[PDB]
Amino acid sequence: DKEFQSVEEEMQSTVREHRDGGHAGGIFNRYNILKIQKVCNKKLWERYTHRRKEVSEENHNHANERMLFHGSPFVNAIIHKGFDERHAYIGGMFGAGIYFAENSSKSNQYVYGIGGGTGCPVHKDRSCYICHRQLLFCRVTLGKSFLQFSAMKMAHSPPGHHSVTGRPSVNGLALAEYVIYRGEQAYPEYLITYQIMRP
Ligand SMILES: NC(=O)c1ccc(I)c([N+](=O)[O-])c1
Ligand SMILES: NC(=O)c1ccc(I)c([N+](=O)[O-])c1
Ligand SMILES: NC(=O)c1ccc(I)c([N+](=O)[O-])c1
Ligand SMILES: [Zn+2]
């Protein structure tokens, strides 16, 4: 209903023009939203809320929950098993965490692998306008989030913190990114099936 409409609006309005000129994610200004499904995995939801309650107790009764995008070739494993820090992006700017973006076009750069990988499996095109892509729109508990501008290779959250917020800087980050170090600190709420569209 209006629930899915607000997801599509969030998806469309957070697109940015990327500095790599579309190298990783493709050349587009909008998507063709094909499908939006709400993921209902009861064991995952309980694992997520149990940790959410715990983080709230450690952050002045505030979870600091945000709706953030995740792009990955492992969407199906995430949907069934949940996010898993044992599969963290080690090559990441903030070390061994699970990365999220508030810009859908940033998470779109990661759907086929790091830097878009080799693109779609059928045409090997990072800018494929034919193949259907999937992105997750997630509930992410940031708790007490550590604000950082430069690269900091963490294995875990910094002491007394529950996440890292990568803020844009000149050297530096173009857009924000959010890093959790425990899989249970995110729930894959919505599965968005989409195509990027030729401008
Ligand atoms: N997707 C959700 O926000 C959500 C809310 C409540 C539940 I009980 C579940 N669930 O996956 O079982 C999901
Ligand atoms: N790399 C993998 O085989 C893999 C398995 C499970 C997961 I939850 C992930 N993951 O990075 O989302 C990756
Ligand atoms: N490991 C991933 O799939 C991944 C890595 C970095 C990022 I910035 C994202 N992301 O969706 O924002 C995902
Ligand atoms: Zn393709």
Sequence letter at residue 95: G
* Residue nearest atom 6 of ligand 2, based on CA coordinates: 77
- In short, whether 89's Cβ falls inside 6 Å of ligand 3 is yes
Atom of ligand 1 nearest to the CA of 41: 11
For the chain, helix (H) and strand (E) counts, in that order, are 4, 8
User: According to DSSP H, which parts of 2-138 are helical?
Assistant: 2-13, 42-57, 75-81, 104-108
CB neighbour burial string for 121-159, b if at least 16 within 10 angstroms, e if fewer: eeeeebbbeeeebbbbbbbbbbbbbbebeeeeebeebbe
Phi, psi angles (nearest 5°) of residue 33 = -70, 115
Secondary structure (H, E, C), 72-102: CCCHHHHHHHCCCHHHCECCCCCCCEEEEEC
Q: Give the method of determination.
A: X-ray
Going from the Cα of 31 to the center of ligand 4, the distance in angstroms, rounded, reads: 15
Rounded Cα distance, 179 and 88, in Å: 10
Q: Count CB atoms within 10 A of the CB of residue 11.
A: 23
Name the residue among 30, 35, 194, 195 with its Cα closest to residue 129. Answer: 195
Structure tokens belonging to residue 179: 């890093």
Is 138 annotated as ligand-binding?
no
- In short, whether 155's Cβ falls inside 6 Å of ligand 2 is no
Mutational pocket test of ligand 2: of 44, 48, 75, 78, the residue with most ligand atoms within 8 Å of the beta carbon? 78
**What does the domain layout of the chain look like in residue ranges?**
1-199
Rounded Cα distance, 114 and 158, in Å: 25
Rounded Cα distance, 162 and 120, in Å: 34
Q: Which CATH number fits domain 1-199: 3.30.56.10, 3.90.228.10, 1.20.1370.10, 3.20.20.70?
A: 3.90.228.10
Contact 15, 29 (CB under 8 A): yes
Atom of ligand 3 nearest to the CA of 89: 1
The Cα diameter of the chain in Å comes to 50
